[PDB]
């Protein structure tokens, strides 16, 4: 439905929707912008990610509430409603994965853009894995593969303090701990990431230092919870 709106207008409206906390609208505007077929800038990639993270975040929070109620009950209503929310969550994840596959990843030549999109691919397969049962095995492997390709590029092309590299490692560690039943891998990755970033902080400006240390704090918080 966004095909008749100018690309620049979709981006401007996504920024307005963000300020208004209208994240469903924001995601629709950014899907429209992606479908214009041009590559996205760093700012635009962030708008896309913020929009869908907030949409799926609300769905995940609701699914967790309903799944907990369903587990304690073990009429059809709780299961039916959990299934409805689950289907809507899967549809949002499928939409994001479809944008990445048609055709954001293949057109991303630079490391900053390719790593960003491969991290997103890992994240949205991870959200699918949270609700999967199989099928679950295949989804987990798709998430792992995307995160690992992103890690390989990031280690070759970005410094250890780069925020995209840090956020990738953080989310891959969460995947290992919460999805893949690999808590030792999660702890090892978070520790190595934190230590390598620490040793590179001396190279950063005051503003970059604040960006990198913000994400390092999340790695530290997880390590405290996991050990």
């Amino acid at each position: 439905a966004m095909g008749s709106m100018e690309r620049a207008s979709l981006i401007q409206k996504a920024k307005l929707a963000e300020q208004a906390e209208r994240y469903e609208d924001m995601a629709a505007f950014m899907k429209g912008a992606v479908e214009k077929g041009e590559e996205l800038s760093c700012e635009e990639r962030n708008l896309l990610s913020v929009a869908y993270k907030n949409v799926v975040g609300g769905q995940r929070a609701a699914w967790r509430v309903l799944s907990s109620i369903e587990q304690k009950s073990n009429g059809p209503e709780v299961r039916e409603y959990r299934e409805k929310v689950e289907t809507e969550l899967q549809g949002v994840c499928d939409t994001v994965l479809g944008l990445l596959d048609s055709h954001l990843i293949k057109e991303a030549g630079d490391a900053e853009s390719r790593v960003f999109y491969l991290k997103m691919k890992g994240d949205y397969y991870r959200y699918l894995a949270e609700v999967a049962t199989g099928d679950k095995k295949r989804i987990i492997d798709s998430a792992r593969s995307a995160y690992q390709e992103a890690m390989d590029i990031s280690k070759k092309e970005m410094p250890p303090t780069n925020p995209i590299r840090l956020g990738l490692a953080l989310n891959f560690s969460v995947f290992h701990y919460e999805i893949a039943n690999s808590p030792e891998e999660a702890i090892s990755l978070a520790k190595t990431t934190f230590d390598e970033a620490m040793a590179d902080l001396h190279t950063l400006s005051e503003d970059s230092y604040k960006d990198s240390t913000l994400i390092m704090q999340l790695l530290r918080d997880n390590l405290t919870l996991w050990t």
Partner: peptide, 6 residues
Amino acid sequence: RSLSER
């Protein structure tokens, strides 16, 4: 639950 990226 573990914290993921903001």
